[PDB]
Design a protein around this nucleic acid. Structure first.
Lengths: 202, 53, 102, 209
RNA sequence: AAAGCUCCUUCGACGAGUCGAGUAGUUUGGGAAUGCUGCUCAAAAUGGGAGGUAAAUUUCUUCUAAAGCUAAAUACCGGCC
RNA sequence: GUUGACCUCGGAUCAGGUAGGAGGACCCGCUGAACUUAAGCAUAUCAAUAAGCGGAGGAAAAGAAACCAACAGGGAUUGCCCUAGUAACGGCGAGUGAAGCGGCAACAGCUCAAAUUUGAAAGCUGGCUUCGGCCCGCGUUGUAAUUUGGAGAGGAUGCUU
């Protein structure tokens, strides 16, 4: 239906119609708080594609981050080490800005579970995201078997354990000859290759 | 509330021995819903469309 | 029976003799085929959305101008030679439909 | 610090190897645990065989090309030829693999026969005793000797071809005209020059025109 | 009411600031650059990724990314025996 | 003008709920050294390790192919033996170092977006109830059934469950 056209329209992010509509919204933002509730999703097709539903227990939050690169925090510039690792300025963080946005929202809403997040807007010093949350204690959620798998006590705070979609990308969780060292867990395989096994009858 | 009477009307008839669609007639109503309406105009079945502003 | 194997290794058509057969095409291989439902949608959106700034520079330079420059410029934006060739060919169609229609 | 005629040593023992050493003192203790689990599982599946049916498959590399072994499951075309519904197969001990294809006809024929005779040896109890159905066993031949392994009773009969054959004289064939050694040399150089010869011949056609 | 099987003219919707490219840092056995992250540019419909040496032209093999769930074989004497 | 709606934003000791702390042997991530070796030393090594920080369970994690291959082709994940001190990296110095095939233990598969129920939102939280049901609300900016590429939809056709 109409949701199909929205998929096609959002692909052309450089057209005059779309470019104007992103500029006005970004000013509407940046005047509210850093983290605040959203009444309804601003991208109905994109949210629907990721599991969002229009029934009680589903909420949307949005947040922005600083859009830069990590600078090593040390007193002045001294590192007290060998010259190979005394750089301070051009270092990079090992997780995407999308992951940090999800993590701060989780601490704010400590009784919900994070499903997914998506890109909404960006600026010279900010990037905006919208996060989908699910209530695990609502009766209307525990009744439906398509989602009640999340109420189990094993899916607690999967934001910072690296279990969402962006967490699997930051790790090498893919098959093939390219993702060899990190297919099943980088630290797990390093243990396997470095263990010395002795049997009874050598 | 109106739907309840029609459903009860059907139940009495189906028990007597007369099948469904013999006591009710074809309905004529206005359509609504974004996905529902979009399909109607692609098949050239609609005659007039009103859009909110 | 596409091709008949020779029956000896280390040759132009080496292999072991066998009776090869033709099999029905799996549904997973129909990814790239066009559909009449998606062509209708993609044509309408192009009318509403319009063009992009980098396309507008090529399309003007493509007519009454160089053709090598229109392809050097397209590669620098899109990033690869294969995509640039296909994009330039498609824009040549839009100029043909516009002026030659009326 | 080498001192005499020695082999140059390479012992990867400069990390903290002592923190990760895995001795195996529970080899016999673990074995008892597995045997307790198998016989416990066999009791739960009282009349059924423990294992599942597998097809015959050839190894995928030029080395090991000769030998055969067991696979994972039967292709959807093999099941159709033998007249078994797709959904009913997994529930009567048959294993199905949906991502394998039958390129040749030799492999297809071997597996169909291997699956057809299994259907003849199957005894199928009815869902409800008081009301049997058409495909159920009519209760007369339900009492017979049964097998439980199904891996030894349905394993690969012979993986390799027979070691040799004996044939009468005057039936020995004649070799290639040039010889066996020269047939290989000619076939090797033909593939090397496939490109040079084709373009030289082709350009001559345009040269004359 | 719901479900299975055999055949067919025709239809057959399939995930975007993503894939990919340039540059910078780190890392790997990965070597004209294996994975990750920052910035600039930014796609397509028999299309797209891969085929361990950079580039152009012409063929071939194999799968269907950018949404999600799930027991067993494995680790451990920290807790209760 | 009066009055009645919609959207956004708030108050309340409103009704009902939920998170923190402990433990951390094993497990998922971030951050991150130097002593030492090279008979000096700066790339390198110790090490993608110690310390620091966040989050779970009796196991955790992984997982039903945008895979491996070049063959007469294999077919989700994890672990053991072998491949192998091998291909490859390295002031090509000291040193570092995987994967495919092969044998075995254990085996199990699946649901969402993209289609008009349109001849009938067919779906759900809550309150009261004699237990038969009623009332407000959420929801058409989309809640059930139907479909997931192995197909499937729409048509034919006779048996069976």
């Amino acid at each position: 239906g109409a949701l199909k056209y929205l998929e096609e329209l959002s692909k052309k992010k450089q057209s005059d119609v779309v470019r104007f509509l992103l500029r006005v919204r970004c000013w509407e933002y940046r005047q509210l708080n850093v983290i605040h509730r959203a009444s309804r999703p601003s991208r109905p097709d994109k949210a629907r594609r990721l599991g969002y539903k229009a029934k009680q227990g589903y909420v949307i939050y949005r947040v922005r981050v600083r859009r830069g690169g990590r600078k090593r925090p040390v007193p002045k510039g001294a590192t007290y080490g060998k010259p190979t690792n005394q750089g301070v300025n051009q270092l990079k963080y090992q997780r995407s800005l999308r992951a940090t946005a999800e993590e701060r929202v989780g601490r704010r809403c400590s009784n919900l579970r994070v499903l997914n997040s998506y890109w909404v807007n960006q600026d010279s010093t900010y990037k905006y995201y919208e996060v989908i949350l699910v209530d695990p204690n609502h009766k209307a959620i525990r009744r439906d078997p398509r989602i009640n798998w999340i109420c189990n006590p094993v899916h607690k705070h999967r934001e910072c354990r690296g279990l969402t979609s962006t967490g699997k990308k930051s790790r090498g969780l893919n098959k093939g000859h390219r993702f060899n060292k990190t297919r099943a867990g980088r630290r797990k395989t390093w243990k396997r290759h470095n263990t010395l096994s002795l049997w009874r009858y050598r | 509330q109106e739907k309840k009477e029609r459903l009860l009307r059907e139940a009495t008839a189906i028990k007597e021995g007369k099948k469904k669609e013999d006591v009710s007639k074809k309905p004529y109503t206005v359509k609504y819903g974004l996905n529902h309406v979009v399909g109607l105009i692609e098949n050239k079945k609609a005659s007039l469309v009103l859009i909110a502003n | 029976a596409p091709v008949e194997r020779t029956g000896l290794i280390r040759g132009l058509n080496k292999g072991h003799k066998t009776t090869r057969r033709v099999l029905k095409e799996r549904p997973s291989r129909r990814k790239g085929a066009q559909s009449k439902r998606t062509q209708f949608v993609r044509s309408l959106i192009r009318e509403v959305a319009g063009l992009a700034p980098y396309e507008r520079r090529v399309i003007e330079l493509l007519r009454n101008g160089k053709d090598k420059r229109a392809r050097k410029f397209s590669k620098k934006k899109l990033g690869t030679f294969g995509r640039a060739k296909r994009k330039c060919e498609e824009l040549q169609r839009i100029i043909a439909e516009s002026r030659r229609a009326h | 610090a080498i001192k005499h005629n020695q082999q140059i040593p390479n012992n990867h023992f400069r990390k903290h190897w002592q923190r990760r050493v895995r001795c195996h003192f529970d080899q016999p203790g673990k074995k008892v645990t597995r045997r307790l689990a198998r016989r416990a599982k066999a009791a739960a599946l009282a009349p059924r065989p423990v294992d599942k049916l597998r097809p015959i498959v050839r190894c995928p590399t030029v080395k090991y090309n000769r030998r055969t072994r067991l696979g994972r499951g039967f292709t959807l075309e093999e099941l159709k030829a033998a007249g078994i519904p797709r959904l009913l197969a997994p529930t009567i001990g048959i294993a199905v693999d949906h991502r394998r294809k039958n390129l040749s006809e030799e492999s297809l024929a071997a597996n169909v026969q291997r699956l057809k005779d299994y259907k003849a040896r199957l005894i199928l109890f009815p869902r409800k005793s008081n009301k049997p159905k058409k495909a159920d066993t009519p209760k007369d031949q339900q009492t017979a000797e049964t097998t439980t392994s199904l891996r030894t009773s349905f394993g690969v009969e012979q993986p390799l071809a027979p070691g040799f054959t004996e044939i009468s004289k005057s039936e020995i064939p004649a070799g290639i005209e040039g010889g066996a050694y020269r047939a290989l040399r000619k076939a090797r150089s033909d593939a090397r020059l496939v490109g040079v010869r084709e373009k030289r011949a082709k350009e001559k056609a345009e040269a004359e025109a």
